[model samples]
Target: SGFRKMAFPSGKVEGCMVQVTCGTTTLNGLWLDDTVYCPRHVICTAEDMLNPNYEDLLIRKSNHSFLVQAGNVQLRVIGHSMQNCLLRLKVDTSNPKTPKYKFVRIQPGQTFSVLACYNGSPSGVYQCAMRPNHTIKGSFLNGSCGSVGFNIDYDCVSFCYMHHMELPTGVHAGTDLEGKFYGPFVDRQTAQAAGTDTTITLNVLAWLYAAVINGDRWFLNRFTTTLNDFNLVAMKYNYEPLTQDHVDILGPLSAQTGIAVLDMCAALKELLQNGMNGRTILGSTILEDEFTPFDVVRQCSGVTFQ
Candidate 1:
């Protein structure tokens, strides 16, 4: 059976509206008729009255899930032995879509946390799902159980980013440095276009050059270790490793180690500029003679183009 659900603040503030529809009719009709219960008030007729079979309804159990509008709001669950039960948020309830909220298992015994996605601007419907039947002390836990609400003008991306990065001051400081150094170049085209111009200050050039150099070294070290050879020819051709190529490249003493090294560096640069960090870069091999000439580095370093 379908039902309508609405929540209000003591009948003093405006309420939210949601209608949940039944997908397919089963032999066992929708167990519980969806209903709305305001806090500490009798069911009213005029302002608070809702259709008996309205699509939106709130289900109650030891642990019940909910989806509510994205904004400043609150959700509370009250019941006996509410301990060991949790109320959590799920960003995307549909399959094939990645969920945003972490599986924050609520603490036992009257525990709760504020679930809000506030950063820049976010908008979505958040849903809640009950944990299960065994842990919660009631039969309502087995059948359909969860709540849905819409959140408007919420910035989920920025909220999640800041939340994930929240940590000790020292840790946060270290991340800032790492983000400045190892992170992707904000405007790669501008950096490349500015090349070795005197207009580009020394500090800017130094940062760019260091990023390139360190990235090259990092690629060489990582690729060699991963594929048993710096050339990684087989990986470039396909997903598999190249055992013979490895033997050939490393078998000879003065064999093309420089090429392998430079190739890995170039691959790393391209990867940082465009490809996925590990997988795509790992799948490429360095080409012979593709290493940067010494003159190019001197130019990039703002020295005479010798």
Candidate 2:
């Protein structure tokens, strides 16, 4: 199938085997098809995932809750494997509320704007997530998927799109960049008064994240004037809610951002291979360690204006 080529370039399903039931349980985040598989496991049934049969999927474990969306139609199974099967789960569109997760570090008056995988703020990225990166836009798209106190304990080992976590803290919202920069209701006051949104628009989120990957200080500063000020906690966890709308926006950017990200990632990897494997700095000086910040940033121009 086209999707088979999309995800499983080898044209076969390789199911993973781990101990029991997607591990402990209690998860909060979102997953997409032909994109990223957060936490773990994307299962297919030789069927089209982008079919128009469903919306977002929600799963609750004991007291904790996490949401799901196969916007591309491919489903991922995390906690409690048996119930998470694509065929078994369904969308709960009764106007779902904000999810309640464990560990929320972003305080009631700070901002967070970061998107990286497995490390950064407490955005979503498996065990390392110590913040919330899954904004309304991020959860909808496919990729990967903060703060606190008055407050900055600073330094976390993992931070994804909407949620993140410090090795010292639980997952919190990655509003470190603040929300006054982007649109869709600027800042937390506007969002909270308007309704209640803790994340920024998709374009901004992707831009900020890509910038981080390439280390773009300019974009980060600009958004600082726009990053959402997350004062109203989502389910008391400094997180955002993942719904169909969030998922739809995320989908449009999934291919665009996902592909764009990999392009830069490829070039940087090229350096790793060329420098370490081939034993040459840009293949000019073997022991020089010859590249500086700007050299790696050569990949930035290619990442932008898309």
Candidate 3:
């Protein structure tokens, strides 16, 4: 795990995309502003010049597994669990003519976190930049239930760069942070170039990310209270030491931790937009590194680079 940084900030949040590659796989994430720096902004600019069509790539998943298909080539993902206790995913690319093959294995464990600003801008009076949107549908958990497990709701996040270093005064007070629809952040054009029109919800993203990232497990850390009140999503995990006496006293236990899954902006889009395919495979055109700087390239820092 290496650290990443951008030289300067420019372009809109739509133009900033982060590509995370490990071995023969690639996972992309979008940044709302210039918080987490990534190189894909340049790649996005170069790809835009090609005027590529992102209409085809198709992928779908059930509880245990999902399938990603690009024309004849396909990535078959099978046998998965949200907990990721003892799980493994198989990536097998199928094509008749090409001799290239991929069979990478990953162990599921910790989940990833998205960087976000704490405060809002404009009035700067004091407004919360984030909130959780979760619902308890039917019976909640059965070990490894998929999308059917719960009714996933879409999340909306209001953000701005001014709130980066400041602390949120409170929730929805009064501040000016541009809100995003919690889809993908790489703008609408990137999806077209990558070739997918389907957008993903947080529920879908949790599973999709675990599928590609290998060790990172997808977990829904929520609680159903007595009344109709329910809690939210927890991506970062925690381990509590409980002695035998503590276990006996508490009985069945879920690690007590903070809840927040929706505050992240457009994250689901980067992971689900282009999806898995030959394009993500090592040495793929998008994976190949070089910036043409064809025109004004966009960045997450709310500016543009010429």
Candidate 4:
């Protein structure tokens, strides 16, 4: 019986019996039925001419190191690796338009550090990650590799004061002030009472600021009563009841506003459960009630206050 001819590219072959020929040289060897096999050519049975498949080739192990350090508003990435190793550092600065990045090559066994500063105002939460040169050879591991970055949360109460400068009349107006204070209803009432159309819109922010700074009992009482009324309405609507978990989530908001966590949770539950209608709790028609301040604080701090 004439042996059949089998053709293959220049590479290692395995499995089955095969007669391999390289140029003018004809070699006779048994192509093992297992992984150990060499060369191929000449002729063999169709069943013996088996095509081999290989597993994925993994990259050589990496010998690299990365460390992260966090300050109030600053973060640092320290790299220790080989001279050929590349380092990429990424930081979340709360600004989507411009994220921070640093890349460098470190000397063998030497350390390199990169620093990043949080630029957001009032407060922000930052996270960082590192990617080391994967080309290095050795069995070393970096925790940041193939994992989400570490995080740091920082607050700057002074920055909130700075934010006031950008607001109308140096403070955040609650919401729809003009409509609340000088709307048709108030206008008609004021006109009927004063015998003229001399209705002035109230500056709710000014009063809130004065109340917060001076601890004015009258303003506090009025604001508290308004919030209570809103909570009552929320309860009437079958809003979700507040729980200890809610208080835990509002801890940061309470810390920022100097409000009790339970109180913040109660207010947030009312606002969120009652929907947009809850914005009218203060009866100021500003659309946002006293809760607006806490919401603003949460936004500045990168926490969910709503």
Which model is ahead, 2 or 4, in terms of TM-score?
4
- Clashing pairs for model 3 are 10-303, 11-303, 11-304, 33-300, 34-300, 54-192, 54-195, 55-195, 109-215, 184-269
Q: Sort by TM-score, best first.
A: 4, 2, 1, 3
Top of the candidates by lDDT: 2
Q: Per-residue lDDT of 1-306 in model 3, one digit per residue for the tens?
A: 111211122222222223322223222222222122111211222344244222221113242233223323333444322211111223343223221211112111111112221111011011111222111111111111110000011222222211111112211111112212212222223222111221112223222222222222222223222111111111211111212332232221111111122311122223223434444321222221111111001111112111
Number of backbone collisions per candidate, in order? 29, 58, 10, 3
Q: Candidate 4, residues 60-146: lDDT per residue as tens digits?
A: 211111122222323222221111111122222222221122122221111111111111111111211111111111111211111
Q: Ranking by lDDT, best first? A: 2, 4, 1, 3
| lDDT per model vs. reference | 0.21, 0.25, 0.21, 0.22
Candidate 3, position 11, lDDT: 20
Worst 10 residues of 4 by lDDT: 156-165
Tens-digit lDDT string for candidate 1 (1-306):
111111111110112111111222101000011222111101112332233211122232222332222223322222212101111222222222222222222211111111222211121222211111101111111111221111111222111101111111111100010112111212111221111111111111122222343233333333323334422533453322334432343222112123343344344334434544443111233221111122123223332111
Where model 3 places Cα greater than 4 Å from the true spot, the runs are: 1-42, 46-225, 229-251, 254-306
Task: Quote each prediction's TM-score.
Answer: 0.17, 0.18, 0.15, 0.19
